[PDB]
DNA sequence: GGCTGCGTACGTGCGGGTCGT
DNA sequence: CACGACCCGCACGTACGCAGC
């Protein structure tokens, strides 16, 4: 019994005190400024007073800040394209103005709108786009890497490696980086290898001189390796 | 002492009574259709003018339209001062709900940390409301429903869609099933891209990623666990024979319902680019 | 110190609401 | 479609503190 009544008082503490929190903030965001604060009824008779003063473009303008995009309604005929198209592709009603958005889309993605057009939503590409409707709207979103194995043997890389030392990925895909390494600290690689395994996620910068900041990867969910990323360049 | 008590009660009764009177006016000069306006709390009606008058301060119907989710707007406070009529089609609740008030008081604890960061231009980050939907419902008795929210800052303006769940689905596009450290379990492929469900099946998706992107898909992965489900940016993952194909994946948790354990994955995954650099 | 208007609080009984079973 | 179960907005009365013909 008691518990609800104090209970009660507390709630309801709350309560008026968020009112008063309202009444200020209302009391600033209202024009009338003053002295300092008048009393309550005061403050929303002026509220009411200046509420008297008095949409869908600024919902438009809305959408154009929040996305970056546009609007379209088509048949693959176009019937009307919005302005904001310019901020985003350019071509405004060049390509565009009464065309098929088909002479607009990448020429190899042009089956995959056909066979969207029997709600509807997709995603395309457009000359310089993620796309929705029922008519509809468009909006937009000297190192090289080497994945290895637990033994050095490799996986993955990135082609710009060419550029750096002047090699091609097959003839390095599946063989050894220690088969690579200058016999002197052909070591030095294995210890850093035999370290990154042991220490779990975080890098590791050795120099063979090519610098290289190996770190291993472990599966997110189960947190077991399998694979080493090393970002390897030159100096 | 009796006599100034009496005229304390009275005269404290014509201060309510102008009270209710303001009120309930403050309720008239709304932009509300009055069929819900007067009807409403006067705690409300100080959320939702507060809400209104920002709104017009901080400043056809074919554009919201064609859009998917709703329109969310916040200050640096978090008091999420509009949202869009179209709220109604998603998470159950209505506007006027929600028009003016904290932002985390509506999502989900454990979740906050990111508004917080993200009240510190281009923003695309997941959030995690509370549908009360399945038709509309009440709270408590409502649940946690997930957004992807893209949106930009002047004071922060959000668009946030809703996901496909995968237990109400629906030539470009191929699903995908996974274990949880995702290793195969079940695939639809090769026209697209190269390789086989038979060949594949049991592998590490991690494995036939590109590294440059594979920074991005751990974290989306990190979200994906963590979160409910995520729509990712754009892979350049791997061929038989070929380079990198840009490819986008809308990707969700299964949770076996008995005592809603997480068992399972499956991705839905689109396709955007060709085979690129064939050797 | 008297007594007043005057206003903002805290406490609470009561009508209308909604959830569980 | 009920009934006490409770929770809540909104009255309500009364309290404490400011000012001042």
């Given at each position: 019994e008691r518990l609800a009544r104090e209970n009660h008082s507390e709630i309801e503490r709350r309560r008026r005190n968020k009112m008063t929190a309202y009444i200020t903030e209302l009391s600033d965001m209202?024009?009338?400024?003053?002295?300092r604060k008048p009393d309550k009824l005061t403050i929303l008779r002026m509220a009411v007073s200046h509420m008297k003063?008095?949409?869908?473009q600024e919902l438009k303008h809305l959408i154009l800040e929040a996305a970056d995009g546009f609007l379209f309604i088509v048949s693959?005929?176009?019937?009307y394209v919005s302005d904001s198209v310019t901020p985003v592709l350019n071509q405004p009603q060049s390509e565009?103005?009464?065309?098929?958005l088909y002479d607009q889309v990448?020429?190899?993605?042009v089956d995959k709108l056909r066979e969207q057009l029997s709600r509807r939503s997709f995603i395309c590409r457009m000359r310089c786009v993620h796309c929705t409707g029922y008519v509809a709207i468009g909006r937009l979103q000297t190192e090289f890497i080497s994945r290895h194995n637990?033994?050095?043997?490799?996986?993955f890389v990135d082609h710009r490696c060419v550029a750096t030392?002047?090699?091609?990925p097959q003839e390095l895909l599946?063989?050894?980086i220690v088969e690579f390494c200058?016999?002197?600290?052909q070591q030095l690689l294995r210890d850093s290898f035999q370290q990154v395994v042991k220490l779990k996620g975080q890098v590791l910068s050795v120099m063979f001189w090519m610098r290289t900041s190996s770190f291993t990867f472990q599966?997110?969910?189960?947190?077991?390796?399998?694979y080493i990323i090393c970002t390897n360049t030159n100096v | 002492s009796e006599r100034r008590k009496e005229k304390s009660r009275d005269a404290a009764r014509s201060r309510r009574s102008k009270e209710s009177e303001v009120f309930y006016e403050l309720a008239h000069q709304?932009?509300?259709?009055?069929?819900?306006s007067s009807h409403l709390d006067k705690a409300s009606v100080m959320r939702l003018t507060i809400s209104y008058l920002r709104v017009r301060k901080l400043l056809?119907?074919?554009?919201?339209?064609?859009?998917?989710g709703f329109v969310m707007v916040l200050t640096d406070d978090g008091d999420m001062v509009y949202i869009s009529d179209n709220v109604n089609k998603y998470?159950?609740?209505?506007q006027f709900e929600l028009?003016?008030?904290?932002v985390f008081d509506f999502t989900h604890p454990c979740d906050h940390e990111e508004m917080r960061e993200m009240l510190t231009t281009q923003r695309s980050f997941f959030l995690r409301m509370k549908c009360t939907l399945t038709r509309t419902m009440n709270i408590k008795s409502a649940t946690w429903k997930v957004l992807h929210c893209t949106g930009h800052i002047h004071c922060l303006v959000l668009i946030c869609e809703p996901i496909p769940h995968p237990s109400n689905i629906e030539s470009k596009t191929f699903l995908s099933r996974h274990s949880?450290?995702?290793?195969?379990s079940y695939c639809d492929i090769t026209?697209?891209?190269?390789?086989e469900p038979e060949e594949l099946?049991?592998?590490?998706?991690y494995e036939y990623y590109h590294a440059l992107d594979s920074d991005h898909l751990t974290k989306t992965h990190h979200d994906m666990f963590t979160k409910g489900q995520v729509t990712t940016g754009q892979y350049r993952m791997l061929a038989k024979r070929g380079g990198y194909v840009w490819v986008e994946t809308q990707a969700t948790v299964i949770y076996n319902?008995?005592?809603?354990?997480p068992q399972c994955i499956v991705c839905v995954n689109y396709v955007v680019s060709g085979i690129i650099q064939h050797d």
């Open positions: 209202v024009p009338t400024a003053l002295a003063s008095l949409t869908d693959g005929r176009v019937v565009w103005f009464g065309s098929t990448h020429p190899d993605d637990i033994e050095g043997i490799f996986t030392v002047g090699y091609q599946g063989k050894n200058h016999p002197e600290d599966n997110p969910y189960s947190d077991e390796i399998e | 709304l932009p509300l259709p009055h069929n819900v056809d119907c074919f554009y919201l339209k064609a859009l998917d998470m159950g609740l209505t028009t003016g008030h904290s949880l450290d995702m290793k195969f026209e697209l891209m190269g390789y099946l049991g592998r590490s998706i319902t008995k005592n809603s354990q």
